[PDB]
Tab-separated table of C-alpha atoms in Angstrom:
chain	number	residue	atom	x	y	z
R	1	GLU	CA	-17.656	-1.516	-3.686
R	2	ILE	CA	-20.621	0.904	-3.668
R	3	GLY	CA	-19.156	2.608	-0.573
R	4	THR	CA	-18.398	6.140	-1.776
R	5	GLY	CA	-18.033	8.363	1.357
R	6	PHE	CA	-15.345	9.140	3.940
R	7	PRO	CA	-17.200	10.007	7.192
R	8	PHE	CA	-14.303	9.334	9.585
R	9	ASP	CA	-13.206	11.604	12.436
R	10	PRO	CA	-10.690	14.227	11.222
R	11	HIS	CA	-7.708	13.428	13.429
R	12	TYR	CA	-4.247	15.015	13.205
R	13	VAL	CA	-1.123	14.147	15.192
R	14	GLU	CA	2.207	15.940	14.880
R	15	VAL	CA	5.273	14.116	13.605
R	16	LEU	CA	8.888	15.244	13.393
R	17	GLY	CA	7.358	18.759	13.486
R	18	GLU	CA	4.701	18.116	10.852
R	19	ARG	CA	0.979	17.348	10.656
R	20	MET	CA	-0.270	13.861	9.712
R	21	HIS	CA	-3.940	13.075	9.184
R	22	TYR	CA	-5.095	9.616	10.180
R	23	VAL	CA	-8.216	7.658	10.973
R	24	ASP	CA	-8.918	6.501	14.458
R	25	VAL	CA	-12.053	4.412	15.028
R	26	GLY	CA	-12.845	1.462	17.289
R	27	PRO	CA	-13.023	0.626	20.982
R	28	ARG	CA	-9.597	2.147	21.757
R	29	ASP	CA	-7.716	-0.916	22.824
R	30	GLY	CA	-7.349	-4.647	22.393
R	31	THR	CA	-4.650	-4.791	19.821
R	32	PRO	CA	-4.792	-1.845	17.372
R	33	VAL	CA	-5.029	-2.344	13.604
R	34	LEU	CA	-2.822	-0.148	11.410
R	35	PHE	CA	-3.964	0.273	7.832
R	36	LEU	CA	-1.049	1.609	5.812
R	37	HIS	CA	-1.894	2.704	2.278
R	38	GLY	CA	0.499	2.781	-0.641
R	39	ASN	CA	0.744	4.645	-3.905
R	40	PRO	CA	-1.072	6.648	-5.031
R	41	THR	CA	-3.791	6.281	-2.379
R	42	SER	CA	-4.532	7.538	1.160
R	43	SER	CA	-6.920	6.715	3.984
R	44	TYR	CA	-9.668	6.850	1.354
R	45	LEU	CA	-8.306	3.463	0.302
R	46	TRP	CA	-9.283	1.710	3.575
R	47	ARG	CA	-12.638	3.512	3.905
R	48	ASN	CA	-15.028	0.637	3.225
R	49	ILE	CA	-12.800	-2.046	4.772
R	50	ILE	CA	-12.365	-0.399	8.194
R	51	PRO	CA	-16.053	-0.451	9.157
R	52	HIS	CA	-15.974	-4.272	9.164
R	53	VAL	CA	-13.254	-4.110	11.798
R	54	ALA	CA	-14.081	-1.152	14.031
R	55	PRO	CA	-16.928	-3.053	15.680
R	56	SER	CA	-14.267	-5.039	17.577
R	57	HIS	CA	-10.878	-3.403	17.007
R	58	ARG	CA	-9.298	0.023	16.977
R	59	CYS	CA	-8.674	0.914	13.351
R	60	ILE	CA	-5.971	3.508	12.641
R	61	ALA	CA	-5.265	4.521	9.064
R	62	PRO	CA	-2.422	7.046	8.598
R	63	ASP	CA	-2.015	9.165	5.494
R	64	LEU	CA	1.618	8.858	4.423
R	65	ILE	CA	3.751	12.011	4.618
R	66	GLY	CA	3.393	14.392	1.720
R	67	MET	CA	0.378	12.225	0.951
R	68	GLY	CA	-3.364	12.699	1.264
R	69	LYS	CA	-4.453	15.168	3.909
R	70	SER	CA	-1.110	15.151	5.661
R	71	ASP	CA	1.358	18.016	5.369
R	72	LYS	CA	3.583	18.370	2.334
R	73	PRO	CA	6.937	18.988	4.016
R	74	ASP	CA	9.244	19.980	1.239
R	75	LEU	CA	11.397	16.902	0.620
R	76	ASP	CA	12.432	14.428	-2.091
R	77	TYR	CA	10.207	11.722	-0.626
R	78	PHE	CA	12.625	8.843	-0.846
R	79	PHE	CA	11.674	5.639	0.971
R	80	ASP	CA	13.547	6.481	4.143
R	81	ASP	CA	11.608	9.710	4.430
R	82	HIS	CA	8.464	7.586	4.744
R	83	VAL	CA	10.106	4.980	6.928
R	84	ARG	CA	11.009	7.937	9.175
R	85	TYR	CA	7.563	9.583	9.315
R	86	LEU	CA	5.696	6.376	10.061
R	87	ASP	CA	8.094	5.291	12.797
R	88	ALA	CA	7.555	8.714	14.420
R	89	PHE	CA	3.776	8.530	14.065
R	90	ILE	CA	3.602	5.019	15.531
R	91	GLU	CA	5.522	6.307	18.575
R	92	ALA	CA	3.507	9.494	18.421
R	93	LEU	CA	0.300	7.463	18.820
R	94	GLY	CA	2.237	5.518	21.469
R	95	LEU	CA	0.915	2.291	20.054
R	96	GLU	CA	2.823	-0.735	21.313
R	97	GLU	CA	1.789	-4.037	19.623
R	98	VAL	CA	-0.223	-3.987	16.399
R	99	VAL	CA	-1.882	-6.033	13.672
R	100	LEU	CA	-0.938	-4.744	10.223
R	101	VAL	CA	-3.148	-4.362	7.195
R	102	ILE	CA	-0.859	-3.122	4.441
R	103	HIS	CA	-1.165	-2.565	0.680
R	104	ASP	CA	1.109	-1.651	-2.239
R	105	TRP	CA	4.061	0.565	-1.059
R	106	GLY	CA	2.281	0.447	2.309
R	107	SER	CA	3.553	-3.100	2.667
R	108	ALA	CA	7.156	-2.135	2.162
R	109	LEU	CA	6.841	0.133	5.203
R	110	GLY	CA	4.680	-2.437	6.969
R	111	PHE	CA	7.041	-5.390	6.448
R	112	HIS	CA	10.026	-3.197	7.156
R	113	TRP	CA	8.576	-1.880	10.383
R	114	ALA	CA	7.755	-5.489	11.363
R	115	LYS	CA	11.161	-6.970	10.516
R	116	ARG	CA	12.593	-4.288	12.812
R	117	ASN	CA	9.866	-4.663	15.426
R	118	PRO	CA	9.010	-8.404	15.342
R	119	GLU	CA	7.662	-8.809	18.881
R	120	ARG	CA	5.387	-5.861	18.194
R	121	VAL	CA	3.595	-7.284	15.189
R	122	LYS	CA	0.691	-9.431	16.325
R	123	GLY	CA	-0.426	-10.214	12.782
R	124	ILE	CA	-0.120	-9.304	9.113
R	125	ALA	CA	-3.018	-8.934	6.656
R	126	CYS	CA	-1.666	-8.089	3.182
R	127	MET	CA	-2.516	-7.792	-0.510
R	128	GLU	CA	-0.546	-6.912	-3.663
R	129	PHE	CA	2.637	-6.166	-1.679
R	130	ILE	CA	6.141	-5.088	-2.755
R	131	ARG	CA	8.677	-7.923	-3.001
R	132	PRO	CA	12.025	-8.199	-4.845
R	133	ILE	CA	11.827	-7.928	-8.641
R	134	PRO	CA	15.002	-9.640	-9.902
R	135	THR	CA	14.376	-8.742	-13.555
R	136	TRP	CA	11.534	-7.308	-15.660
R	137	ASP	CA	10.360	-10.548	-17.223
R	138	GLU	CA	9.589	-10.940	-13.516
R	139	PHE	CA	7.613	-7.707	-12.964
R	140	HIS	CA	3.858	-8.276	-13.272
R	141	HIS	CA	4.747	-11.851	-14.119
R	142	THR	CA	2.102	-14.414	-15.156
R	143	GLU	CA	1.966	-17.885	-16.609
R	144	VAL	CA	-1.557	-17.440	-17.937
R	145	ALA	CA	-1.285	-16.763	-21.684
R	146	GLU	CA	-4.315	-14.559	-22.297
R	147	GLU	CA	-2.680	-12.051	-19.964
R	148	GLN	CA	0.965	-12.023	-21.207
R	149	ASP	CA	0.063	-8.904	-23.220
R	150	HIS	CA	-1.190	-6.937	-20.237
R	151	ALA	CA	1.976	-7.634	-18.193
R	152	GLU	CA	4.078	-6.345	-21.053
R	153	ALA	CA	2.103	-3.125	-21.327
R	154	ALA	CA	2.539	-2.638	-17.565
R	155	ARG	CA	6.210	-3.583	-17.800
R	156	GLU	CA	6.666	-0.857	-20.426
R	157	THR	CA	4.557	1.572	-18.415
R	158	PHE	CA	6.790	1.346	-15.356
R	159	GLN	CA	9.671	1.412	-17.845
R	160	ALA	CA	8.741	4.989	-18.694
R	161	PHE	CA	8.304	6.054	-15.046
R	162	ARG	CA	11.915	5.125	-14.329
R	163	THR	CA	13.432	7.043	-17.235
R	164	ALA	CA	14.925	10.549	-17.394
R	165	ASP	CA	12.092	13.043	-17.950
R	166	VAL	CA	8.925	11.172	-18.900
R	167	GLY	CA	8.655	10.004	-15.326
R	168	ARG	CA	8.085	13.669	-14.567
R	169	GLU	CA	6.039	14.573	-17.652
R	170	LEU	CA	3.752	11.554	-17.218
R	171	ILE	CA	3.439	11.221	-13.458
R	172	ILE	CA	3.893	14.874	-12.587
R	173	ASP	CA	2.609	17.143	-15.397
R	174	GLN	CA	0.125	14.613	-16.748
R	175	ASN	CA	-0.656	12.915	-13.383
R	176	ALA	CA	-0.265	9.422	-14.868
R	177	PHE	CA	-0.549	7.652	-11.529
R	178	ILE	CA	-3.882	9.209	-10.492
R	179	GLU	CA	-5.472	9.643	-13.892
R	180	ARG	CA	-4.628	6.304	-15.551
R	181	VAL	CA	-2.679	3.883	-13.323
R	182	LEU	CA	-5.036	4.017	-10.317
R	183	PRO	CA	-8.364	3.571	-12.125
R	184	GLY	CA	-6.319	1.190	-14.241
R	185	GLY	CA	-5.702	-0.962	-11.200
R	186	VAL	CA	-9.399	-1.430	-10.363
R	187	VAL	CA	-11.460	-3.827	-12.433
R	188	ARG	CA	-14.875	-2.094	-12.129
R	189	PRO	CA	-15.484	1.581	-13.013
R	190	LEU	CA	-14.481	4.400	-10.643
R	191	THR	CA	-17.069	7.153	-9.974
R	192	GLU	CA	-15.995	10.859	-10.199
R	193	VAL	CA	-16.533	11.497	-6.482
R	194	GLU	CA	-14.182	8.547	-5.895
R	195	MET	CA	-11.744	10.153	-8.313
R	196	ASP	CA	-12.087	13.666	-6.958
R	197	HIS	CA	-11.309	12.143	-3.582
R	198	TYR	CA	-8.163	10.533	-4.862
R	199	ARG	CA	-7.372	13.583	-7.039
R	200	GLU	CA	-7.868	16.135	-4.237
R	201	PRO	CA	-4.560	15.801	-2.394
R	202	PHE	CA	-2.950	16.455	-5.732
R	203	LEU	CA	-4.185	19.481	-7.645
R	204	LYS	CA	-0.717	20.955	-7.985
R	205	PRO	CA	1.746	19.277	-10.345
R	206	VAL	CA	4.454	20.623	-8.016
R	207	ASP	CA	3.086	18.186	-5.464
R	208	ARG	CA	2.924	14.996	-7.486
R	209	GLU	CA	6.551	14.343	-6.491
R	210	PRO	CA	5.907	11.312	-4.282
R	211	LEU	CA	3.748	9.549	-6.872
R	212	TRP	CA	6.966	9.912	-8.888
R	213	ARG	CA	9.560	8.909	-6.322
R	214	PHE	CA	7.722	5.643	-5.563
R	215	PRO	CA	8.027	4.085	-9.053
R	216	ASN	CA	11.733	4.965	-9.019
R	217	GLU	CA	12.193	3.584	-5.527
R	218	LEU	CA	10.798	0.267	-6.812
R	219	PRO	CA	13.317	-2.534	-6.251
R	220	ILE	CA	13.507	-3.586	-9.901
R	221	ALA	CA	16.704	-5.092	-11.266
R	222	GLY	CA	18.809	-4.393	-8.138
R	223	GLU	CA	17.950	-0.708	-8.676
R	224	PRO	CA	18.237	1.067	-6.336
R	225	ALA	CA	20.752	-1.214	-4.569
R	226	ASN	CA	19.621	0.185	-1.243
R	227	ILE	CA	15.884	-0.426	-1.205
R	228	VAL	CA	16.457	-3.802	-2.812
R	229	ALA	CA	18.605	-4.977	0.100
R	230	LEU	CA	15.852	-4.223	2.605
R	231	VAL	CA	13.206	-5.964	0.546
R	232	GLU	CA	15.316	-9.091	0.196
R	233	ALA	CA	15.667	-8.476	3.909
R	234	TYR	CA	12.072	-8.474	5.090
R	235	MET	CA	10.881	-10.986	2.587
R	236	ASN	CA	13.600	-13.149	4.122
R	237	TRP	CA	12.281	-12.200	7.583
R	238	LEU	CA	8.695	-12.756	6.504
R	239	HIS	CA	9.517	-16.121	4.995
R	240	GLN	CA	10.716	-17.222	8.381
R	241	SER	CA	8.250	-15.424	10.671
R	242	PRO	CA	5.730	-17.336	12.821
R	243	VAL	CA	3.293	-14.365	12.811
R	244	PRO	CA	-0.083	-15.470	11.388
R	245	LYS	CA	-0.615	-14.110	7.890
R	246	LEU	CA	-3.580	-12.951	5.870
R	247	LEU	CA	-3.007	-12.431	2.189
R	248	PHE	CA	-5.771	-11.485	-0.188
R	249	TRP	CA	-5.705	-12.002	-3.881
R	250	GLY	CA	-7.518	-11.542	-7.184
R	251	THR	CA	-7.589	-12.744	-10.767
R	252	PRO	CA	-5.764	-11.533	-12.777
R	253	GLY	CA	-3.958	-9.952	-9.816
R	254	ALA	CA	-0.997	-7.733	-10.619
R	255	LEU	CA	2.052	-7.607	-8.330
R	256	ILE	CA	0.722	-10.937	-7.009
R	257	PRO	CA	-1.061	-12.905	-9.735
R	258	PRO	CA	-2.894	-16.076	-8.651
R	259	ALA	CA	0.185	-18.303	-9.215
R	260	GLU	CA	2.187	-16.590	-6.504
R	261	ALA	CA	-0.583	-16.250	-3.954
R	262	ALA	CA	-0.955	-20.022	-4.253
R	263	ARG	CA	2.826	-20.399	-3.860
R	264	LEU	CA	2.887	-17.958	-0.948
R	265	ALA	CA	0.165	-20.084	0.666
R	266	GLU	CA	3.031	-22.398	1.663
R	267	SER	CA	6.095	-20.242	1.151
R	268	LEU	CA	5.014	-18.077	4.107
R	269	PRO	CA	4.358	-19.874	7.421
R	270	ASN	CA	1.005	-19.637	9.193
R	271	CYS	CA	-0.620	-18.036	6.197
R	272	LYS	CA	-4.263	-18.144	5.133
R	273	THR	CA	-5.190	-16.786	1.692
R	274	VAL	CA	-8.557	-15.303	0.573
R	275	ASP	CA	-9.864	-15.035	-2.993
R	276	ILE	CA	-11.616	-11.744	-3.631
R	277	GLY	CA	-12.685	-12.673	-7.130
R	278	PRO	CA	-12.010	-10.613	-10.150
R	279	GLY	CA	-9.363	-8.008	-9.225
R	280	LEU	CA	-6.309	-6.093	-10.471
R	281	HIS	CA	-3.970	-4.115	-8.172
R	282	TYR	CA	-6.200	-1.825	-6.067
R	283	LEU	CA	-8.214	-4.673	-4.514
R	284	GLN	CA	-9.778	-2.403	-1.919
R	285	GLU	CA	-11.920	-0.894	-4.684
R	286	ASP	CA	-13.114	-4.240	-6.128
R	287	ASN	CA	-14.311	-6.396	-3.234
R	288	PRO	CA	-13.782	-4.471	0.069
R	289	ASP	CA	-16.641	-6.161	1.948
R	290	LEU	CA	-14.948	-9.568	1.820
R	291	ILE	CA	-11.549	-8.039	2.681
R	292	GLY	CA	-13.137	-6.617	5.861
R	293	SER	CA	-15.353	-9.644	6.674
R	294	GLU	CA	-12.278	-11.854	6.702
R	295	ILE	CA	-10.105	-9.372	8.625
R	296	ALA	CA	-12.876	-9.186	11.188
R	297	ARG	CA	-12.920	-12.994	11.404
R	298	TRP	CA	-9.158	-13.537	11.313
R	299	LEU	CA	-8.543	-11.195	14.266
R	300	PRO	CA	-10.083	-12.648	17.370
R	301	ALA	CA	-7.927	-15.798	17.450
R	302	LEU	CA	-4.758	-13.641	17.415
């Protein structure tokens, strides 16, 4: 998506005693849309999708704590830390019912906030989201042959992130997530302005900590027992939830290759899928016009 700039109004609310940047655009009612980014992104991630929606809805796009232009409170950045800071923000913005547009680790928070706040979620638009990974032969799974190689590489890649010192060398000293994994996850080439934008919140290896904690929070193998249980928990909720669902996909996909999205087209009730064409993991950067066109369209009848 040609869209290279981030012209939004520089808003900042305070949360559990801490500043959080966010994007607020749109009429300023109906039912607000929350765009929750994952790792290792920020509001910059939703920047060309949101304009499709603002014409009709209020688009809010928080920058996770320790992430983006938010504040870097000094903490480990587990998953509950983020759970906490959102929940405080949401109340801070005093927003009542929402529609949710949620990405990678942004969907873990999204689905978790919804499973705890069912009658507050008016709809769920999602794409490459975090669900339970029983084993590794299951991570980045695929039943297309020509791609069995790529899933292995990735499997090994996340392998390293989760191991004693190499997680920290790679992700932290060498900024693996920003410098290789991100641009990795987008099919087309990523301009330097686009990179600088993603790089910016991150010029200090001492700060890369969250882009490290996330990989190790990943519910792979029943590790860590705790996150796992809440992902089994909201995927169980989701699987049973009437809330209308919008799930976007891409070939070869990543966390959700085409096989699953097709499965999830029936596995999840009241669920339309949309094919964004060639894409990897960071779909927002491959075909963001469509993603917004179809959010725009999917909303009114909610």
